[PDB]
């Protein structure tokens, strides 16, 4: 049985499946930040001073 | 379709104008980055 555990807790496979998860994690989180990319448009198209009179 | 020929020209005028909006925005965006980078030194 130690052989059968060591077949499938193989450190050759533990390290594979751990590395794969990390790449997908940074792929998804950065794909959330470009999903919030529009602040760069909002801060750009509106620069309106005039309301300092309104202030 | 000579009418559509004169139509098509009048169509392209709107595309040409559309892009002219787009690059106008980027022009100011670049100028904002310049103003920042001067303040960056």
UniProtKB/TrEMBL annotation, chain A:
Protein name: Vps20/32/60-like protein (ESCRT-III)
TrEMBL record, chain B:
Protein name per UniProt: Vps20/32/60-like protein (ESCRT-III)
Annotated organism of origin: Lokiarchaeum sp. (strain GC14_75)
Portion held of the full protein: 15 to 55 of 218
Domain of life: Archaea
């Amino acid at each position: 049985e130690l052989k059968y555990i060591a077949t499938e807790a193989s450190p050759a496979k533990v390290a594979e499946i751990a590395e794969d998860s990390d790449v997908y994690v940074s792929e998804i989180e950065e794909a959330a930040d470009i999903l919030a990319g529009d602040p760069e448009i909002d801060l750009g198209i509106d620069v309106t001073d005039e309301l300092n009179q309104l202030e | 379709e000579k009418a559509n020929l004169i139509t098509n020209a009048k169509v392209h005028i709107h595309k040409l104008n559309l892009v002219n909006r787009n690059y106008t925005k980027r022009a100011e965006i670049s100028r904002k980055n310049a103003k920042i980078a001067l303040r960056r030194g």
